[PDB]
Write a protein that binds this ligand. Structure first.
Ligand SMILES: CCCCCCCCCCCCCCCCCC(=O)OC[C@H](CO[C@@H]1O[C@H](CO[C@H]2O[C@H](CO)[C@H](O)[C@H](O)[C@H]2O)[C@H](O)[C@H](O)[C@H]1O)OC(=O)CCCCCCCCCCCCCCCCC
Ligand code: CLA
Ligand code: CLA
Ligand code: CLA
Ligand code: CLA
Ligand code: CLA
Ligand code: CLA
Ligand SMILES: CC1=C(/C=C/C(C)=C/C=C/C(C)=C/C=C/C=C(C)/C=C/C=C(C)/C=C/C2=C(C)CCCC2(C)C)C(C)(C)CCC1
Ligand SMILES: CC1=C(/C=C/C(C)=C/C=C/C(C)=C/C=C/C=C(C)/C=C/C=C(C)/C=C/C2=C(C)CCCC2(C)C)C(C)(C)CCC1
Ligand SMILES: CC1=C(/C=C/C(C)=C/C=C/C(C)=C/C=C/C=C(C)/C=C/C=C(C)/C=C/C2=C(C)CCCC2(C)C)C(C)(C)CCC1
Ligand SMILES: CC1=C(/C=C/C(C)=C/C=C/C(C)=C/C=C/C=C(C)/C=C/C=C(C)/C=C/C2=C(C)CCCC2(C)C)C(C)(C)CCC1
Ligand code: OEY
Ligand SMILES: [Cl-]
Ligand SMILES: [Cl-]
Ligand SMILES: [Fe+2]
Lengths: 442, 82, 50, 137, 341, 334
């Protein structure tokens, strides 16, 4: 029925060749994660910040606490090697399984075993496979907790003294905090869950998520869908694909904003400064320089009449001036020591800016996530010399693009699933065209 | 539904086709290569070599400013480098 | 019937009324010239050609 | 036009002496300047303090004069403000501050001479474009 | 049975590539326009006319190579190989911009050739010549932009150069100098091109989603026979869908397909007229009433006044390098600049 | 006969002159809210401090604008990405100075258009159609999401979203070119290929069908009366069109299958506009068009300009002029 270019649709009702397709494709994933880490480590120079080197995987490993010490300095590269090799090796085993089940294995599973066999329309079996995978994911989330609490901790950009690897002993359990984030506006100064800003809340939320996932896994093993759910959904392989494409799209969008705004679970030590951070850093940089020359930065009126260096947010908080007035919700470890209760504190500004904060401000203003597709750093009008594009832009853009096509894929397969379920996905039956049996509109 | 020429799919799967075209195709690629590696393409077309956009201490474009003396102006400029 | 953009095709085989139309066009064009000159004369200042 | 020994001949010190660099040293230096300095100093300006640039005329009015190989090598070791009144290694890269600016760790003495030589040669090649900013892009 | 009729027979034979009488104009000119551009983009500088590198030989990539226009000093010279400027020297001709006129003029005659081909093939096969008529829009754009426009100005220098990024610079020149986006002939052109793409997508989508089921396969392409009499999609169901979705829908398959011809062809023709005006610097640059208010009232600001400041930046910052024959020298202090930047 | 079932039956009825549906239940109110606010503000709103510098910009007809220069002006940079509903303002006067209508209009609009896309899926199901017209519309919807939501998210402020005005649109695209160089970005180039190409294929397909209409009328009547709505037979001769177009190019460059032809007509512009929408959306995070500034240098090291450098001169002129009172520091980092 299907053409070569829709050829994978021929696997819909071949559980054995479809198991192979999935497992072989999971091998490609593990393979990429493996090769790419080794490629990054082969290219890694430790005296250069990670974000001057096009690294996206090594920062993920560092953030988990491996390889790094105080301030994000890399101290031991062997955990990066290990993570790549193990992934790499494990892909051969998935690849082996994958081509075995796609080529030589039982083409359908149901004849060989009633446990592994499935029919898409079996609501109990489908909720049972969903149950198993929910548990697996619950376990995965708890592995993050175990690492944070019993196997070294995690990197904490907020730890006093430049940031450091820190073990997490009082995870947040209070559901008001954890589920409070889920209820926060996604808008400015609020951030929905992208505002999470300390590792205690990260680890606590993962305990919850692992329990909820294990409980739901068990729930879905032990139940079958209720009749309101049975009548609400399409129950077909393509329909389940469409639901998951919807979900991954949503998640891709979320991850986009997370790597763009969050500097806790994407430490700027590793990923480079966020857009807001770098903009705030510039205002800081010139406040520092001009004050050193004698400028009274609190009393300097800028051309518009707003403060040149310092003004008020719309709720009163003292903030950086210029266009970065838009970025006053930014919070970061190099800047919070200057915040008092009314926003930025003028006596702290006048007396207590340290050199490390001057360096960090200068470093981040000159490493903002602006650059060209061919990796010329900076604003579009800058000349060639600096080969830099922030990992934050590479990860934000790439995952925006993927998220968008999966929403398109969600629409594609959802509408097709609906039409196939009612039986007109192949077109209109000339002998029974529904419009010809309706009254006309006028 | 054909006009009588030999089908392409038939020609480019044929041993004779590839016997002729494994000589011709590299021969042309090599010729065009030599057009550039020899430096001939510079001289045919008038294109400045990396060292002859400017005279040594000169930062002025040698811009053609005359319609009918144009030819002579270009030549004057080329002297300013030899 | 005829669309709006074809009303004048009724002259294609009517040399009489074709000439009638060409006369009316010619009338309007010469009318224009005369009206345009008179308007320019009523507004022209002739007192400084420099 | 080309990269001749005249272009590559820059002052060694304030006494009057000259060193003549090679094409190798020049391309070496350009490359290390991109590695260690262009994030702030692309094109001979200074992003984080645009009032101070790398134009030869600006360097010659620095205290310690910096329009020679020695001035510049020295600055890369023990930088000072423009009037020479205060050492600024804590906020500017240099070998003295290579703990806090790790990129300076693997710079040999000859790397410093190349970098310094690129700085003095480039304005002879690009003129006003070196240190002039976007007006000359 | 004379030589003319024998030659007619031979030109109009049914072969893989139809020739026709129109092929005698078409094929040489098409091929020389194409050959010139590839030749020049590979080997030929713009140093002497523009101060620009512009070939692969010189280091340019696909986006920056161009066959650039001749120097402003050439005026509107035909710049014939054998003409008074190049005097037959092929090399000089290339350095003076001879390939620009060569490409423009052969391209012009090739476009005539192509439209005559559309007429010639249409007559032989027995169809109406609406595809030829439609092709007048591209011809108007080409002649108005590449020929009329620079003929109204000082020289060929200000026509577009044949290159990706050179055309980008043409786009920005017209914004800064002509405020071309403010021109309603351009606006009608935009509506026609974006209307065209809309109609393209929405008609293709409608048909593919009102298909009749005419075979049994999940791929519905196989269930069309190119000689079936029956429509392959339901006009009635498409019309009901858009009627209830959008309020109105097509009911006449002929008007629909005529409308698809009409929308983009008209838009291009409209933009062509705007460009004819810009040949004479007859722009829609300004709104007089806004300028009178803004001059007298320094608190009055619109998006209209904000875009003219942008145009003023464009002119002052790009003109010295884009118009090198003028020897503009603008000190740092005369350049218009906002605060800080 | 159950009351809710009756309501569910009118909502989803295919006999309503305009289909409502469940998506329509969100679409109708949200689009009326956005429309009514837009019309009122376009006529009568007072000047808005778009860049947060107390430099209000007049957008409406009553404050000295015409149709071409008028706009509903984006909300203040002081607000950034903060949510500014009416009830968060001390007074409607405050809300108006600070740009609150722009937020009301664009959020209702994006919602309502999203539902517009759902509504297209939904009526197709009720009529027994194939489902994908809404995938086509997702190209323009994505493009609207990019200029009104995604780009403001990446840059940190709705003050950099596209104005709801004709000249405001131009301001938006000029400043975009200076800060991103969209022209040198490949996803915009596919957008141009998508839109030029779609206009081309629009004209071709329209000219090819019109060329090959079967004679059904006299010279005195519109050829269009030769098609009767709902007739079974095709109204043109696709073999005559294919025979014409195949000869104009060559045989195998011309479609003989009407289904492939119309799918191709759908796919080309939809895909090119997907890309251009994704280009705006990725330049939202500053992954900009190619930069070849000073890429060609001579043997001494002189810069040898290219057309890319002339582009850069123009871009520089837009950069230094835009929002001329809004920058205090040398880099325009957002
Ligand atoms: C659509 C149909 C599709 C088919 C398309 C077929 C494509 C065919 C291509 C034909 C090529 C056309 C060549 C035209 C060259 C041209 O014009 O060349 C220009 C020359 C005149 O030369 C110009 O003349 C100018 C004025 O000079 C005069 O003024 C100077 C200052 O006072 C001095 O006195 C000087 O001595 C004196 O000559 C400047 O000198 C320019 O630099 C010089 O180029 O005219 C001449 O050749 C001829 C001018 C009179 C004939 C008019 C030609 C009609 C086409 C022009 C329409 C555009 C109208 C513009 C309005 C928009
Ligand atoms: C988990 C993800 C997922 C899964 C399992 C499927 C599964 C399926 N899809 Mg859906 N699809 C998805 C995501 C997914 N899709 C997304 C995200 C979109 C939107 C982009 C679509 C849009 C879509 C359409 C339009 C159709 C399907 C169809 C199908 C079926 C057959 C597909 C096939 O044979 O591909 C065969 C694979 C190819 C022909 C190759 C694809 C080439 C891609 C486009 C190029 C990408 C290149 C990349 C960008 C970089 C290249 C670098 C270079 C060096 C090579 C199958 C059931 C078909 C269907 O309805 O069947 C029921 C169908 O018509 N898919
Ligand atoms: C991740 C991508 C992916 C995966 C996993 C699959 C997997 C599969 N496809 Mg799809 N497919 C894909 C992409 C993919 N496809 C794309 C892009 C297209 C468009 C061209 C198609 C088009 C397509 C069609 C048209 C059909 C399939 C079919 C199938 C199945 C049977 C293939 C078969 O008979 O092998 C025959 C092929 C071989 C025997 C060649 C050998 C290939 C081997 C596996 C390469 C392995 C090399 C590797 C280095 C070995 C490592 C070994 C070591 C680990 C021990 C299989 C499960 C078929 C199906 O559904 O059957 C009913 C079918 O009809 N696919
Ligand atoms: C999906 C996420 C993702 C992201 C964000 C990155 C991001 C990065 N990679 Mg990795 N990469 C990926 C997947 C990813 N890659 C995959 C799947 C492969 C295997 C092919 C690689 C192979 C790879 C190598 C070998 C290298 C990188 C490098 C880099 C860096 C430079 C990117 C560049 O210049 O691209 C250039 C931009 C393009 C090629 C544009 C592609 C546009 C496509 C065609 C559109 C797709 C639309 C549809 C999907 C950057 C940090 C470089 C680096 O610095 O390493 C340290 C490097 O050398 N990557
Ligand atoms: C999700 C993936 C998946 C699924 C659902 C199946 C399902 C199946 N396989 Mg396949 N297979 C897979 C992956 C998978 N396999 C992989 C990865 C490989 C390569 C290692 C193979 C190689 C393979 C062969 C060679 C054969 C099967 C066979 C079978 C069938 C019987 C399995 C059984 O009872 O064995 C008994 C089960 C066990 C002894 C399970 C012991 C515990 C496992 C090994 C570890 C689980 C730990 C953890 C979850 C994952 C690993 C840790 C890692 C992540 C670090 C069944 C249909 C047989 C068949 O159908 O042939 C006719 C058969 O001969 N499989
Ligand atoms: C992969 C995850 C996953 C998936 C696919 C499913 C799938 C399913 N579940 Mg299970 N479930 C899971 C995880 C999952 N579950 C976990 C972890 C738990 C434990 C809490 C449960 C607990 C659970 C129960 C108790 C029940 C189901 C039921 C069902 C079925 C109907 C789903 C439905 O109508 O919801 C669609 C959603 C709604 C109808 C309500 C919308 C509510 C959300 C919160 C609105 C917010 C959306 C917003 C825009 C996004 C932001 C989030 C916000 C909170 C901030 C379906 C088979 C039902 C069933 O038939 O059970 C046998 C049922 O009664 N599930
Ligand atoms: C000498 C010039 C001339 C003459 C005598 C004709 C004569 C004719 N044309 Mg042709 N035509 C011409 C120039 C000419 N045309 C030009 C320059 C164009 C391109 C714009 C066309 C494009 C054209 C098309 C596309 C069509 C014709 C058609 C026709 C026929 C029917 C016209 C009709 O009923 O209009 C009726 C028109 C009106 C009732 C109102 C039109 C008003 C227009 C829109 C604007 C106002 C004009 C203004 C008042 C006065 C002109 C000022 C200035 C131009 C001098 C008729 C034989 C039609 C045909 O072939 O039918 C078989 C047809 O479809 N013509
Ligand atoms: C089915 C199918 C398919 C697919 C397939 C797949 C997807 C595959 C898989 C496969 C795989 C997925 C593979 C993998 C493999 C791997 C391997 C085999 C590994 C090995 C490794 C090694 C050897 C290592 C070593 C080392 C070390 C240890 C250290 C470091 C260095 C080195 C690296 C050397 C296709 C579509 C084509 C077709 C159809 C069918
Ligand atoms: C980890 C973590 C955390 C936590 C979190 C959590 C806890 C989460 C949750 C989550 C959740 C809990 C989610 C939810 C979701 C939901 C959803 C997403 C839903 C959906 C729905 C839908 C989709 C539906 C549909 C429908 C309708 C509406 C109608 C009927 C039909 C249907 C069914 C189709 C935190 C942040 C603290 C921190 C960091 C980390
Ligand atoms: C009867 C008679 C008489 C009288 C006569 C007369 C009184 C005449 C008049 C006439 C005239 C008094 C006429 C005039 C005409 C005019 C015209 C014919 C006009 C035209 C117009 C046009 C067509 C326009 C168009 C347009 C517009 C409106 C806008 C802009 C564009 C254009 C230009 C296109 C006499 C005593 C001798 C004798 C007896 C008889
Ligand atoms: C001007 C002239 C002339 C003419 C010449 C000619 C005629 C030439 C030709 C030439 C030619 C005829 C050339 C060609 C060239 C070509 C090329 C250079 C190509 C390239 C291509 C490529 C690069 C592609 C690639 C690709 C891609 C990218 C994607 C897909 C795939 C492909 C493969 C397509 C004569 C002699 C009369 C003399 C006077 C002057
Ligand atoms: O581009 Mn230039 O960058 Ca985005 O902000 Mn800084 O300036 Mn301003 O307000 Mn709208 O615009
Ligand atoms: Cl502006
Ligand atoms: Cl600022
Ligand atoms: Fe059609």
């Amino acid at each position: 029925g299907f053409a070569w270019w829709a050829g994978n649709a021929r696997l819909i009702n071949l559980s054995g060749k479809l198991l192979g397709a999935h497992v072989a494709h999971a091998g490609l994933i593990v393979f990429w994660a493996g090769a790419m880490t080794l490629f990054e480590l082969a290219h890694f120079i430790p005296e250069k910040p990670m974000y001057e080197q096009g690294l996206i995987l090594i920062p993920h490993i560092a953030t988990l606490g491996w390889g790094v010490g105080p301030g994000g300095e890399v101290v031991d590269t062997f955990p990066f090697f290990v993570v790549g090799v193990v992934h790499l090796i494990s892909s051969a085993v998935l690849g082996f399984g994958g081509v075995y089940h796609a080529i030589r294995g039982p083409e359908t599973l149901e004849e060989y075993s009633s446990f592994f066999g499935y029919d898409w329309k079996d609501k109990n079996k489908m909720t049972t496979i969903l149950g198993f995978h929910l548990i697996v994911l619950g376990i995965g989330a708890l592995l993050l907790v175990a690492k944070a609490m019993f196997f070294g901790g995690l990197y904490d950009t907020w730890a006093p003294g430049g940031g450091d690897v820190r073990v997490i002993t009082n995870p947040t359990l209070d559901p008001r905090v954890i589920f409070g984030y889920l209820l926060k506006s996604p808008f400015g100064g609020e951030g929905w869950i992208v505002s999470v800003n300390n590792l205690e809340d990260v680890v606590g939320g993962h305990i919850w998520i692992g329990l909820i996932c294990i409980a739901g896994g068990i729930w879905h093993i032990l139940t079958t869908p209720f009749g309101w759910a049975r009548r609400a959904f399409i129950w077909s392989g393509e329909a389940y694909l469409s639901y998951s494409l919807g979900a991954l799209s949503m998640m891709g969008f979320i991850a986009t904003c997370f790597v763009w705004f969050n500097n806790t679970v994407y430490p700027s030590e590793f990923y480079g400064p966020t857009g807001p951070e770098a903009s705030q850093a510039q205002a800081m940089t010139f406040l520092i320089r001009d004050q050193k020359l004698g400028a009274n930065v609190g009393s300097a009126q800028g051309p518009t009449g707003l403060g040149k260096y310092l003004m008020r947010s719309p709720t009163g908080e003292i903030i950086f001036g210029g266009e970065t007035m838009r970025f006053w919700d930014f919070r970061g470890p190099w800047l919070e020591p200057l915040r008092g209760p009314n926003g930025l504190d003028l006596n702290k500004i006048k007396n207590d800016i340290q050199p490390w904060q001057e360096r960090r401000a200068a470093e981040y203003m000159t490493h903002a996530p602006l650059g060209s597709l061919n990796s010329v750093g900076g604003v579009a009008t800058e000349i060639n010399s600096v080969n830099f594009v922030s990992p934050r832009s590479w990860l934000a853009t790439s995952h925006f693009v993927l998220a968008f096509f999966f929403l398109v894929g969600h629409l594609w397969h959802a509408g097709r699933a609906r039409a196939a379920a009612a039986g007109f996905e192949k077109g209109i039956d000339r002998e029974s065209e529904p419009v010809l049996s309706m009254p006309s509109l006028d | 539904g054909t006009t009588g020429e030999r089908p392409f799919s038939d020609i480019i799967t044929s041993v004779r086709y590839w016997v002729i075209h494994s000589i011709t195709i590299p021969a042309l690629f090599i010729a065009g290569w030599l057009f550039v590696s020899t430096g001939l393409a510079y001289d045919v077309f008038g294109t400045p070599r990396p060292d002859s956009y400017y005279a040594q201490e000169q930062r002025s474009i040698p811009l053609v400013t005359d319609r009918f003396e144009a030819k002579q102006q270009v030549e004057t400029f080329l002297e300013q480098l030899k | 019937g005829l669309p709006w953009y074809r009303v004048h095709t009724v002259l294609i085989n009517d040399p009489g009324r074709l000439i009638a139309a060409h006369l009316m066009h010619t009338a309007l064009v010469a009318g224009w010239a005369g009206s345009m000159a008179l308007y320019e004369l009523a507004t022209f200042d002739p007192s400084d050609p420099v | 036009a080309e990269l001749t020994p005249e272009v590559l001949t820059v002052p060694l010190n304030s006494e009057g002496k000259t060193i003549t660099l090679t094409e190798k040293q020049y391309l070496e230096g350009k490359r290390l300047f991109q590695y260690a300095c262009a994030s702030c100093h692309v094109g001979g300006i200074t992003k984080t303090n645009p009032s101070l640039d790398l134009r030869t005329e600006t360097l010659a009015l620095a205290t310690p004069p910096r329009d020679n190989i020695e001035g510049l090598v020295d600055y890369m070791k023990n930088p000072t403000t423009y009037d020479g009144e205060q050492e600024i290694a804590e906020v500017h890269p240099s070998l003295r501050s290579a703990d806090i600016f790790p990129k300076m760790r693997n710079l040999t003495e000859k790397d410093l001479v190349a970098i310094a030589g690129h700085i003095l040669v480039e304005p002879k090649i690009l003129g006003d474009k070196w240190g002039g900013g976007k007006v000359y892009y | 049975r004379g030589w003319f009729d024998i030659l007619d027979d031979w030109l109009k034979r049914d072969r893989f590539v139809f020739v026709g009488w129109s092929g005698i104009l078409l094929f040489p000119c098409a091929y020389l326009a194409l050959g010139g551009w590839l030749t020049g983009t590979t080997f030929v500088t713009s140093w002497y006319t523009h101060g620009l590198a512009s070939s692969y030989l010189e280091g340019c990539n696909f986006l920056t190579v161009a066959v650039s226009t001749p120097a402003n000093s050439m005026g509107h010279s035909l710049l014939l190989l054998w003409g008074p400027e190049a005097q037959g020297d092929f090399t000089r001709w290339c350095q003076l911009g001879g390939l620009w006129t060569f490409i423009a003029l052969h391209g012009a005659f090739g476009l005539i050739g192509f439209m005559l081909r559309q007429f010639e093939i249409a007559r032989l096969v027995g169809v109406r010549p609406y595809n030829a008529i439609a092709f007048s829009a591209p011809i108007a754009v080409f002649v108005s932009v590449f020929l009329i426009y620079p003929l109204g100005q000082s020289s060929w220098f200000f026509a577009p150069s044949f290159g990706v990024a050179a055309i980008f610079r043409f786009l920005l020149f017209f914004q800064g100098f002509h405020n071309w986006t403010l021109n309603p002939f351009h606006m009608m052109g935009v509506a026609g091109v974006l209307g065209g793409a809309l109609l393209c997508a929405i008609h293709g989508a409608t048909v593919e989603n009102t298909l009749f089921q005419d075979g049994e396969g999940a791929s519905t392409f196989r269930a069309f026979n190119p000689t079936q009499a029956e429509e392959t999609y339901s006009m009635v169901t498409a019309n009901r869908f858009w009627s209830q979705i959008f309020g109105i829908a097509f009911s006449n398959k002929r008007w629909l397909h005529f409308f698809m011809l009409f929308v983009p062809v008209t838009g291009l023709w409209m933009s062509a007229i705007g460009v004819v005006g810009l040949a004479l610097n007859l722009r829609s640059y300004d709104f007089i009433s806004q300028e009178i208010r803004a001059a007298e009232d320094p608190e009055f600001e619109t998006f209209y006044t904000k875009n003219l400041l942008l145009n003023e930046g464009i002119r002052a910052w790009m003109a010295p390098q884009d118009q090198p024959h003028e020897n503009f020298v603008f000190p740092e202090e005369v350049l218009p600049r906002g605060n800080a930047l | 006969a159950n009351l809710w079932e009756r309501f569910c039956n009118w909502v989803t009825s295919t006999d309503n002159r305009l289909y409502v549906g469940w998506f329509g239940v969100i679409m109708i109110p949200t689009l009326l809210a956005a429309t009514i606010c837009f019309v009122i503000a376009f006529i009568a709103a007072p000047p808005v401090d778009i860049d947060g510098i107390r430099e209000p910009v007049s957008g409406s007809l009553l404050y000295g604008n015409n149709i071409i220069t008028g706009a509903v002006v984006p909300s203040s940079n002081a607000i950034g990405l903060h949510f500014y509903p009416i009830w968060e303002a001390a007074s409607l006067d405050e809300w108006l100075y600070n740009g609150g209508p722009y937020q009301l209009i664009i959020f209702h609009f994006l919602l309502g258009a999203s539902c517009y896309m759902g509504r297209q899926w939904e009526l197709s199901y009720r009529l027994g159609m194939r489902p994908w017209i809404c995938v086509a519309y997702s190209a323009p919807l994505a493009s609207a999401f990019a200029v009104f939501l995604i780009y403001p998210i990446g840059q940190g402020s709705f003050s950099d979203g596209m104005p709801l005005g004709i000249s405001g649109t131009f301001n938006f695209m000029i400043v975009f070119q200076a800060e991103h160089n969209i022209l040198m970005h490949p996803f915009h180039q596919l957008g141009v290929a998508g839109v030029f190409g779609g206009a081309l294929f629009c004209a071709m397909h329209g000219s090819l069908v019109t060329s090959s209409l079967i004679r059904e009328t006299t010279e005195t009547e519109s050829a269009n009366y030769g098609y009767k709505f709902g007739q079974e037979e095709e109204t043109y001769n696709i073999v005559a069109a294919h025979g014409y177009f195949g000869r104009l190019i060559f045989q195998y460059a011309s479609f003989n299958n009407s289904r492939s032809l119309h799918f191709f007509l759908a796919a080309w512009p939809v895909v090119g506009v997907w890309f251009t929408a994704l280009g705006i959306s990725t330049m939202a995070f500053n992954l900009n068009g190619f930069n070849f500034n000073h890429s060609v240098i001579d043997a001494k090291g002189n810069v040898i300009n290219t057309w890319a450098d002339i582009i850069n001169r123009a871009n520089l002129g837009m950069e230094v002029m835009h929002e001329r009172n809004a920058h205090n520091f040398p880099l325009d980092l957002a």
